[PDB]
């Protein structure tokens, strides 16, 4: 087909990211998967991961039940109000809809039903493999529905077969830049918020998804400094916040490189300067706050930023001291499964734990660069998705705990090895200074557990004489 050749051109434009340092390298993250040896998620999963936390919007999945039916209500995000994003919404295409070409009609009436029943600020329509393969003009359906029903309908053209979850995050960002960002001016500063001596600056947090409500540890610090977050994309976000992103003074890239197209395009279009950073660990949280003052050119903000850091660092270092002995010197094996695992490494450094980070050939070039930075330039990559290689690596380095994404949980649990989840599905917050306390509590919970000696000890009948 001729329509599918023009789609593969757009995919190559997204993979060409001049803002990243590994643009002149062979893109290993988005490489052709090996049949019968693949473990990752599709582009549809990637776009929904980035746009679902926009809480008040109708999130319609266009396609058969395999796409939404197996994946709905599984976002580790927390909302402070609306929860329409938790409702599974899908066209649930029948065989006759694919054969008779009745999927555009089905999608059109699905947007109408969502608008009538829930009256949302906006509707996001996600494209999937079946409608992308067949003749399905998702863009034109969304354009027609926006006009006929009066509610903005944004099309995220991210069918699963386009690529990996990281490609979906780029397509999600592209959909926001093209249809949402720049469509509404920010609200005036709330009445009563006038703090004399505090200059309020507008900022964006791109890549913060408020997993388990962890951003609600950072939000009070930003508030104390006088930083109005126009939009946290997409942690606890509302459609109306996203529209105003163009009027931010500084942009912060939070633990992500798949959303780098957003920060770059916002600097090219609106002149908004940006910076990469993280809120995982003491050193990282303080550096993120220091970078904001550096780009906002305000000496009063800079002085208050140092004052906040000196206060929060004194409180957190005092609280971490009774625990310091319990986690000092514990060996940690970190695995990078493209689930932003390197961001939590800095937090483990603030505890005196030697970490052995490892990755595969299918991992991104940024994951590989961070492994050469700490382990060494002649490091060894696992390459294949064989979990027995990862288990062997634990025993090789005498690792006490495996820190990786939730997929590798049963590899460590069944291999009788302590594990700590750091994926977009955990129930514990590790961001900011307060999050450091929860991280050491969770590390001690699994490490100091008597369950490990019980599962390693054999049955009393399987004991030799």
């Amino acid at each position: 087909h001729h329509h599918h050749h023009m789609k593969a051109k757009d995919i190559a434009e997204l993979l060409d990211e001049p803002a990243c340092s590994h643009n002149k390298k062979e893109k290993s993250g988005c490489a052709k998967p090996k049949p019968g040896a693949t473990d990752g998620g599709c582009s549809f999963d990637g776009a929904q991961i980035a746009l679902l936390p926009v809480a008040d919007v109708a999130h319609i999945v266009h396609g058969p039940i395999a796409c939404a039916g197996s994946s709905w209500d599984n976002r580790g995000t927390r909302s402070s109000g609306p929860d329409l994003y938790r409702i599974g919404m899908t066209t649930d295409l029948t065989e006759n809809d694919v054969i008779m070409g009745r999927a555009e009609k089905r999608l059109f009436h699905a947007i109408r039903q969502a608008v009538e029943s829930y009256s949302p600020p906006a509707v996001f329509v996600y494209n999937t493999c079946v409608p992308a393969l067949i003749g399905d003009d998702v863009d034109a359906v969304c354009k027609a529905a926006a006009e006929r029903f009066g509610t903005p309908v944004i099309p995220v053209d991210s069918a699963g077969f386009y690529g990996t979850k990281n490609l979906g995050n780029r397509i999600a960002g592209e959909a926001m830049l093209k249809y949402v960002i720049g469509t509404r001016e920010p609200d005036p500063l709330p009445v009563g918020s006038e703090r004399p001596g505090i200059r309020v600056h507008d900022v964006n947090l791109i890549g913060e998804y408020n997993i388990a409500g962890e951003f609600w540890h950072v939000l009070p610090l930003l508030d104390e400094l006088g930083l109005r977050v126009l939009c946290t994309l997409a942690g606890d976000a509302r459609y109306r916040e996203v529209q105003t992103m163009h009027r931010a003074e500084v942009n912060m890239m939070v633990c992500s490189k798949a959303m780098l197209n957003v920060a770059r395009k916002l600097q090219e279009t609106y002149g908004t300067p940006w910076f990469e950073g993280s809120f995982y660990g003491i050193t990282d949280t303080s550096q993120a706050l220091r970078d904001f003052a550096r780009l906002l050119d305000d000496p009063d903000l800079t002085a208050r930023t140092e004052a906040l850091i000196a206060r929060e660092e004194a409180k957190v270092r005092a609280a971490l001291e009774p625990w310091r002995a319990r986690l000092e010197g514990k060996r940690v094996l970190l695995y990078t499964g493209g689930v932003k695992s390197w961001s939590v490494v800095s937090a483990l450094q603030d505890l005196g734990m030697k970490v052995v980070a490892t990755g595969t050939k299918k991992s991104t070039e940024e994951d590989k660069a961070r492994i050469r930075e700490l382990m060494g330039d002649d490091v060894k990559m696992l390459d294949e998705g064989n979990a027995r290689v990862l288990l062997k690596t634990v025993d090789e380095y005498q690792a006490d705990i495996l820190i990786a994404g939730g997929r590798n949980m049963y590899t460590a649990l069944k291999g009788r090895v302590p594990f700590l989840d750091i994926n977009q599905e955990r129930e514990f917050g590790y961001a900011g200074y307060d999050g450091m306390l929860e991280l050491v509590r969770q590390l001690c919970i699994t490490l100091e557990c008597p369950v490990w000696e019980a599962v390693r000890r054999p049955a009393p009948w399987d004991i030799p004489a």
Partner: protein, 450 residues
């Protein structure tokens, strides 16, 4: 029952799970097996998360990795490359070749792609591959599971007729999707108590029962129904069918073996368990053990003590047809009325139901129906929690998925003791939530500022 078929464009809060997943679950009930989805990487990833969150165990599941190029130009080579890769890296006892909506839309003929692998890699001739046509746009998780047992029966059972009875104490059991590893343990143990030898097809109580295997690492299913044992299905005296959904698999087994069968719905309630134990007693010649006679009197007591709260209770059920029909009969023996019944897709067994109507729909439809009918409880999976909170009524979790309840995957609903525990749980939920006569504050009361 008169079916109210799907009519609305948007499925809101989907009840239905894919046909492909159910078929993978049946393949998962085979020892040292690897289910293989012919489609994009995302279908497998979502199915893996679905099962891992329900069973809380590692789940073997692979993909042919269909990309933009192989989806338009053709993906038969991906099937051959995946079969070879799994055969050399994990050396399986059986592989399940299941198709997705993407592969069926393209036009991938299973019996062509499998043939090409068989002619290129003859070194893996003895590794049986079960082919099943399971596109996501058709059927559901339950019917999909039922389709995989039919394909399993047609692939791993020999086509004979002259061996009926060769294994005199062996009795086949065709198990359905909603039979938990706990239900399967009751089936096997009850059969074993009659001196009989059970042959469970398939056996999820061997793979996903929730046990720590001896090996530190396993890539395939740690147990279940072996292909070596499944080949002895013709030698069995009788075949018991548990769940109406497996009517097509029971016919496939009956034509190919000649082994006579007795069919059952869910083993729920006074009458379903009575008929189960009667068939077992007749087949083995031995009487019903005293152990099961005592549990019948315990169920009768459980029905006396819970009658006060369950007689006239209005319930709302959102589950597969085998669970709906199994729970309706259980509740009907107590005088409880199912005032809302929603299924993910049609079923022949629904036509022969005492309910006036059953809706094909989703969890939004369930909430609308339960509110109209004034339901007091909801029986449904974990997704049904929000429907129940919005309705203001308790929820009794049943069916897939059960990601929010630890140990829910292995609950035994089956049997006399299993039926009693459902009655105690419905009774306890109904009591805990019952708000009695609300306090009336007299306008003349001598009560100090409360």
């Amino acid at each position: 029952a008169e079916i109210i078929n799907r009519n609305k464009a948007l499925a809101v809060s989907p009840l239905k799970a894919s046909q492909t997943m159910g078929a993978a679950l049946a393949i998962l009930g085979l020892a040292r097996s690897m289910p293989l989805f012919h489609g994009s990487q995302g279908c497998t990833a979502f199915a893996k998360v679905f099962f891992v969150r329900h069973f809380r165990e590692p789940v073997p599941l692979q993909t042919t990795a269909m990309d933009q190029v192989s989806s338009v130009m053709g993906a038969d080579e991906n099937v051959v490359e995946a079969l070879k890769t799994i055969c050399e890296r994990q050396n399986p006892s059986v592989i399940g070749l299941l198709t997705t909506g993407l592969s069926e839309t393209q036009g991938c003929d299973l019996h062509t792609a499998l043939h090409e692998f068989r002619t290129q890699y003859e070194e893996y001739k003895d590794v049986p591959i079960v082919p099943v046509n399971t596109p996501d746009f058709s059927g559901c998780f339950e019917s999909g599971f039922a389709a995989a047992v039919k394909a399993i029966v047609e692939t791993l059972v020999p086509e004979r007729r002259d061996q009926v009875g060769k294994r005199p104490r062996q009795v086949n059991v065709l198990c359905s999707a909603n039979l938990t590893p706990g239900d399967l343990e009751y089936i096997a143990e009850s059969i074993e108590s009659f001196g009989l030898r059970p042959l469970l097809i398939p056996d999820l109580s061997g793979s996903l029962d929730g046990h720590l295997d001896e090996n530190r690492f396993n890539a395939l299913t740690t147990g279940g129904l072996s292909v070596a044992e499944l080949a002895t299905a013709g030698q069995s005296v009788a075949t018991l069918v548990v769940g109406q959904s497996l009517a097509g698999a029971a016919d496939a087994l009956a034509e190919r073996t000649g082994v006579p069968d007795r069919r059952f719905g869910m083993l729920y309630g006074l009458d379903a368990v009575d008929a189960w134990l009667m068939a077992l007693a007749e087949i083995s010649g031995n009487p019903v053990p005293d152990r099961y006679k005592r549990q019948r009197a315990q169920l009768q007591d459980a029905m006396l003590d819970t009658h006060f709260m369950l007689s006239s209770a209005r319930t709302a059920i959102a589950a597969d047809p085998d669970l709906l029909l199994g729970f309706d009969a259980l509740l009907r023996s107590m005088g409880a009325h199912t005032v809302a019944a929603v299924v993910p897709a049609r079923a022949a067994a629904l036509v022969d139901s005492p309910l006036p109507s059953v809706r094909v729909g989703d969890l939004e439809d369930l909430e609308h129906a339960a509110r109209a009918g004034q339901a007091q409880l909801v029986i449904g999976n974990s997704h049904a929690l929000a429907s129940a909170r919005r309705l203001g009524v308790p929820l009794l979790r049943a069916g897939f998925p059960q990601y929010d309840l630890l140990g829910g995957f292995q609950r035994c609903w089956s049997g006399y003791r299993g039926s009693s525990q459902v009655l105690f749980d419905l009774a306890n939920l109904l009591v805990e939530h019952h708000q009695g006569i609300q306090p009336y504050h007299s306008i003349y009361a001598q009560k100090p500022a409360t």
